[PDB]
Structures are given as C-alpha cells and as structure tokens.
Amino acid sequence: QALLIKVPTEIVVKVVDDVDVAAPAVGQVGKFDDELYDEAGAQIGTSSGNFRIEYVRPTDGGLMTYYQEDITLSDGVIHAEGWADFNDVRTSKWVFYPATGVSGRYLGLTGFRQWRMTGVRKSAEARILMG
C-alpha cells in the first residue's frame, strides 16, 4: 500500500510571522493556515501549522527550521513535522519532513510531506507520499 497526493496549488490564506525573508534569523517564527487544491481547482484540504527557525547548520549556513502542521483532507488528517532549510524555502526549492496518518484513510500510514514555495506568504506546490 503506497499513495501519492499531488497538490499543484496550495494557498497560504493566513500567516502571522516575524521572519525577515531577505535576512532570516534564528528565533523567528510563523503560524499559518493553508488551503490545498487539485489539478481542477477543487479544494481537497487545509493545513494549519507553525514553524520556528532554530539554528544555523555550521557546514553551509542552512537556516534550520522546525515545522509542525496538521493537514486535514476530505478523507482524513495527516500530522507532519520536522526540519527544513529556510534558505531552500525562500528560494523556491523543495523541502520535506515526515508525516504520520492520524485519521480516516491515513490511519496506520506513514510517509512524507513535501512542498515548495512558489509565492512568498501566498502560494506553494506540494506532494504527500504515504505507505
């Protein structure tokens, strides 16, 4: 059993944050609510989550940020949390972290939440891959 959910458009509907996107810093935080859409423009879910920039990776200056969210799809909830490099976030590169099925279709499944910013504080593309 493997499943893939493609999310060609994910909209940031509300975000409260103190990130400076041009010069982000350790200790900056954000809280967000998104809406997830399929290839036809139908809404397939929402997400509500938060993040904190925690440390700078010493090898390359990556801005290591801990994300936590609950993704509510029409057929169940998936919790996702883990690490991303905020330099990848702000440069429209893919980021990822583990996801754990909480309810519905996803109970007992585990996998990965992936996304890439396409518009600052407004839009992304995403994939959820579970097994």
Residues contributing to the site for a second copy (CB under 8 A): 1-4, 54-55, 57-59, 64, 66, 96, 98, 111-112, 127, 129-131
Q: Which helix (H) or strand (E) holds 14?
A: strand 3-17
CB of 77 to a second copy, least distance (A): 19
CB of 103 to a second copy, least distance (A): 20
| Distance set, CA 90 to CA 1, 78, 100, 111 (Å) | 34, 24, 25, 24
Tell me the three state secondary structure of residue 54. strand
> How many residues are listed for the chain in this entry?
131
Considering beta carbons, is residue 78 or 130 the nearer one to a second copy?
130
Considering beta carbons, is residue 12 or 80 the nearer one to a second copy?
80
Tell me the three state secondary structure of residue 64. strand
CB of 129 to a second copy, least distance (A): 5
